[PDB]
Amino acid sequence: ELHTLRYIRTAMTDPGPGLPWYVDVGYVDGELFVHYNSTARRYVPRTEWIAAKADQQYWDGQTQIGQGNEQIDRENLGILQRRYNQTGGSHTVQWMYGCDILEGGPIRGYYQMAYDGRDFTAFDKGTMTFTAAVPEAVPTKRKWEEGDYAEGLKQYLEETCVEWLRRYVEYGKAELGRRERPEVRVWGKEADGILTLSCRAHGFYPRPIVVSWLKDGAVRGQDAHSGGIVPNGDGTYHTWVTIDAQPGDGDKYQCRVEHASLPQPGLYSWEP
């Protein structure tokens, strides 16, 4: 049903010691598959399916865009410095554009930008006009409307983006459609007169998972602390929840784990 393509850039003035200033990255269904670097100057695959099922002209043609996309962002950084009347320092340019599809057809199409952690511009496809969030982005709105780049973006977001996305899903249908089961461990420790239990699901896929604490067969969303869902190195996800409770009450609490991989939601109890 729902498949999402998203490309993302990050041009930086002060990236750090021994780090690249510009990086361009792509994501399919919330999973990293394509990567570009300013040091390497070539697009490279992160997943197996995109690497296996792609010719050289795909990479060479994509690299020419990446080397292009690197060059404009060098010019951009300099343009904003003069527009804001800034001497220099730690500034960054961000780009965020993609396309969503449901049962074949497209639903959403976006093309945005932010400067120094704040929205700069955004392409509204329905009205066929770019929006100026900040007074410093008003010149860009006039530039991008006079020269109809909006016609070019509509062609990309609706036609180009979708045709490539359908192909990417077909290549990694097995690797996107797979399901991995979470290795769950329950543990608790005394803090300062208060027992602090903690459920910890390790390696699982897909991303969205529901983990909660059940006191006496009843969901307790009070006193529960969660750190959200966080990624791993090998294309899988991790989560963690903890609950403050009275000492001795160990058998009362239970960690329920609801996930797509599991048909029945598995309950876990603390037993050492």
Peptide bond into 206 cis (omega under 30): yes
Among 135, 234, 264, 271, binds other proteins (CB under 8 A): 234
How many residues at the interface with other proteins, by CB under 8 A? 64
* Residue 98 token pair: 């993609």
Let me know: does 121 contact 140? Beta carbons within 8 Å: yes
- Choose between 198 and 218: whose C-beta lies nearer to other proteins: 198
Among 3, 24, 101, 245, binds other proteins (CB under 8 A): 24
Of the candidate spans 86-94, 173-181, 204-212, 215-223, the one that interacts with other proteins by CB under 8 A turns out to be: 86-94
Cα separation, 115 vs 127, in Å, equals 23
202 touches other proteins by CB under 8 A: yes
Let me know: does 93 contact 76? Beta carbons within 8 Å: yes
Would strands 210-215 and 224-231 be described as parallel, antiparallel, or unpaired?
unpaired
Of the candidate spans 89-97, 174-182, 210-218, 246-254, the one that interacts with other proteins by CB under 8 A turns out to be: 89-97
Binding site for other proteins (CB under 8 A): 7-8, 10, 12, 14-16, 19, 23-26, 32, 35, 46, 62, 65-66, 68-69, 72, 75-76, 79-80, 90, 92, 94, 96-97, 114, 116-121, 137, 139-140, 143-144, 147, 149, 152-153, 156, 160-161, 164, 183, 185, 187, 200, 202-203, 227, 230-234, 238, 240
